[PDB]
Amino acid sequence: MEALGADVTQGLEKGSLITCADNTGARELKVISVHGYSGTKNRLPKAGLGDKITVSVTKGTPEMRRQVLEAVVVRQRKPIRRPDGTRVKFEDNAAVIVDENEDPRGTELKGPIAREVAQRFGSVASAATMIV
């Protein structure tokens, strides 16, 4: 993929429960896999900011629940490093549901976003309320 323009310490694992920052109808999401990743023996597969993950819907509307969909990580508690040395961290862990073409499934995003996510998913960013 295109370079993020920042270093990321993955703060999420396979099985992690995170926040779905949108209005698709899904509230809580569970990470199942990370696109393009292949780890090593005994290592629990990891995900972080700017990564595209496969997810299952834990909470939300009856229809959205149990559905296996794709998503993009937008915010994470573990710190990341900007090119100027400064560290940046968020209040929670969140991702936005997305389709085959990387276009947000919902109509609106809930909460802030990392400027770095724009360099990868412009159509997701071009729906952002706040880009920090």
Partner RNA sequence: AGGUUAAGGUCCCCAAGUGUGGAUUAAGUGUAAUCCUCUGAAGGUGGUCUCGAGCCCUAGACAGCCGGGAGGUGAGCUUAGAAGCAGCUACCCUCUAAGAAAAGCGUAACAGCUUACCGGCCGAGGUUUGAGGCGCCCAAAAUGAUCGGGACUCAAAUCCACC
Partner RNA sequence: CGACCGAGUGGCUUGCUACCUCGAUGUCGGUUCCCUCCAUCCUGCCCGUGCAGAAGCGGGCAAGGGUGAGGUUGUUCGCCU
Partner RNA sequence: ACGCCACACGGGGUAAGAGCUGAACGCAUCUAAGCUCGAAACCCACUUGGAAAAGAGACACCGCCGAGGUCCCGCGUACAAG
As given in the structure block, the two tokens for residue 99 are: 């389709």
> In the complex, which residue's CB is closest to Mg ion?
42
Question: Which residue, 62 or 85, has its beta carbon nearer to Mg ion?
Answer: 85
Is 16 a binding residue for Cl ion by CB under 5 A? The answer is no
Is 86 a binding residue for RNA by CB under 7 A? The answer is no
Query: DSSP readout, 77-126?
Result: SS-EE-TTS-EE--SS-EEEEE-TTS-BSSS-B-SEE-GGGTTT-HHHHT
Residues 76-115 that bind another protein (CB under 8 A): 83-85
- In whole angstroms, the minimum distance from the beta carbon of 41 to Mg ion comes to 7
Contact indicator for 116, 4 with CB cutoff of 8 Å: yes
Residues 38-67 that bind another protein (CB under 8 A): 40-42
Is 5 a binding residue for another protein by CB under 8 A? The answer is yes
The phi and psi torsions of 119 (rounded to 5 degrees) equal: -65, -20
Which residues of this chain interact with another protein, rule CB under 8 A? 3, 5, 40-42, 83-85
